[PDB]
Amino acid sequence: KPWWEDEWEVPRETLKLVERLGAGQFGEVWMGYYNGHTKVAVKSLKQGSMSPDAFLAEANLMKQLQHQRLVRLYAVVTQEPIYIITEYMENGSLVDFLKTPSGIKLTINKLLDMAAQIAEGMAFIEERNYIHRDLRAANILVSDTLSCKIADFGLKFPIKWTAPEAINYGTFTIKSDVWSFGILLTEIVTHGRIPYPGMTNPEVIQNLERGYRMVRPDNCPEELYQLMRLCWKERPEDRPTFDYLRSVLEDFFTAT
Numbered sequence: 738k739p740w741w742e743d744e745w746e747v748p749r750e751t752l753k754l755v756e757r758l759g760a761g762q763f764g765e766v767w768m769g770y771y772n773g774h775t776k777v778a779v780k781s782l783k784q785g786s787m788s789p790d791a792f793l794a795e796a797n798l799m800k801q802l803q804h805q806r807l808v809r810l811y812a813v814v815t816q817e818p819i820y821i822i823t824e825y826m827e828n829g830s831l832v833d834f835l836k837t838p839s840g841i842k843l844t845i846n847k848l849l850d851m852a853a854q855i856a857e858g859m860a861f862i863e864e865r866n867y868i869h870r871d872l873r874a875a876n877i878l879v880s881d882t883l884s885c886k887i888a889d890f891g892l893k894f895p896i897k898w899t900a901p902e903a904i905n906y907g908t909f910t911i912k913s914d915v916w917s918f919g920i921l922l923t924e925i926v927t928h929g930r931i932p933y934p935g936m937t938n939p940e941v942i943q944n945l946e947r948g949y950r951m952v953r954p955d956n957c958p959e960e961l962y963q964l965m966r967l968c969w970k971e972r973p974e975d976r977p978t979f980d981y982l983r984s985v986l987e988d989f990f991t992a993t
């Protein structure tokens with residue numbers, strides 16, 4: 738293959754962009770087709786918006802992080818406008834899905850299931866010594882069979898999902914993902930509502946420093962709430978692993 742193309746290269750002609758799923762800063766995201774019959778998602782780089790290499794580092798990363806619980810890389814097009822193509826999740830973002838007529842009717846059993854699924858994906862990430870840095874419902878995709886996969890739309894880390902040592906020292910580890918995950922759990926159980934209902938960031942900041950944690954969300958299973966508490970332990974080293982988290986969630990799930 739020529740040097741000016743990636744090992745994962747495909748001709749642009751094999752792709753047809755049909756629907757804009759989101760636009761913005763560094764490019765856009767489209768739902769499309771690969772060779773007509775195969776649905777795909779396509780992230781396109783807004784020229785000059787950021788370095789092509791900078792853009793393409795994400796795909797090089799996904800090359801080493803292939804797993805069924807994570808969005809799979811399909812190919813790339815490295816001639817402007819640069820594209821990164823992945824599989825296509827039909828039910829969109831978890832935050833949006835939890836609000837559709839279907840998502841709203843999801844039982845606590847299904848929710849715990851999806852939580853374990855995400856924990857499973859985070860367990861793989863943990864095993865590979867990678868750090869997500871933005872684990873939230875907004876970065877979780879749902880399939881037509883209602884299965885979840887971790888993603889990162891690459892969108893100042895907004896406080897509410899960011900652990901103390903991260904907000905204060907900029908130090909991110911798999912232990913801060915564990916914290917973010919605890920927050921993700923509130924989104925799941927409340928069908929997508931923003932964490933810390935009615936509190937501004939500095940209020941959340943002052944509360945955590947005092948040792949306070951988020952008020953028990955409405956209708957949240959107390960066992961689930963306590964599991965969230967573990968994710969919010971002061972010392973990063975006292976927070977659990979994702980294998981443990983997946984493990985407990987599977988038990989709550991199989992008990993419901």
Ligand SMILES: Cc1ccc(NC(=O)c2cccc(C(F)(F)F)c2C)cc1C(=O)Nc1cnc(Nc2ccc(N3CCN(C)CC3)cc2)nc1
Nearest residue numbers: 778779780802808821823824825826827829830887888889
């Ligand atoms: C195109 C693309 C290219 C790349 C990526 N990359 C990632 O993730 C990613 C990045 C870094 C690290 C990691 C890892 F560590 F976890 F490995 C990942 C993993 C994501 C996408 C990417 O965004 N893919 C995608 C988008 N939409 C959909 N479906 C999708 C999304 C939203 C809706 N929506 C419903 C209709 N509503 C109008 C708009 C929202 C409907 C389908 N399915 C897949």
